[PDB]
Amino acid sequence: NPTLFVSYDQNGKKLSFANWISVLSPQDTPFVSMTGKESINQTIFSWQT
Amino acid sequence: TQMVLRAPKRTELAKDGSYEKWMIEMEVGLRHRNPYASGVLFTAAGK
């Protein structure tokens, strides 16, 4: 027999989920950013010195 | 007539305790004019 109208009258009792994600994982790639790219045509190449 | 004596009212609450409980009181009565004016009809099974 609820009688005391306490300061809680939420009919929409849904939760309070957040609206973001704290994905703090490094992604920097300086070595590859500096090296450079070049296309090839086979899986086994060679270079002379 | 829906005779009314005391309208819903509250006492002195909020003594900084276990309060925040409310209530709805009502003092009401019934009255009929000329009893031999209206009528009641019961249900009958036998005699």
Per DSSP, what are the bridge partners of residue B4? B28
What tokens does A35 get? 């090296």
SS3 B5: strand
Cβ contact A3–B21 (<8 Å): yes
Per DSSP, what are the bridge partners of residue B29? B3
Cβ contact A3–B20 (<8 Å): no
What tokens does B24 get? 């709805």
SS3 A44: coil
In a mutational test of the B interface, the residue from A6, A7, A8 whose CB has the highest number of chain B CBs within 10 Å is A6
Beta-carbon contacts of residue B3 (< 8 Å; ≥ 6 apart): B28, B29, B30, B31
The Cα–Cα gap between A45 and B19 comes to 84
Name the strand (E) or helix (H) holding B6: strand B3-6
Experimental structure resolution, Å? 3.4
The residue assigned the tokens 């009919």 is A11
Structure-determination approach: cryo-EM
* Interfacial B residues in 9-28 facing A (CB < 8 Å): 20-23
SS3 B29: strand
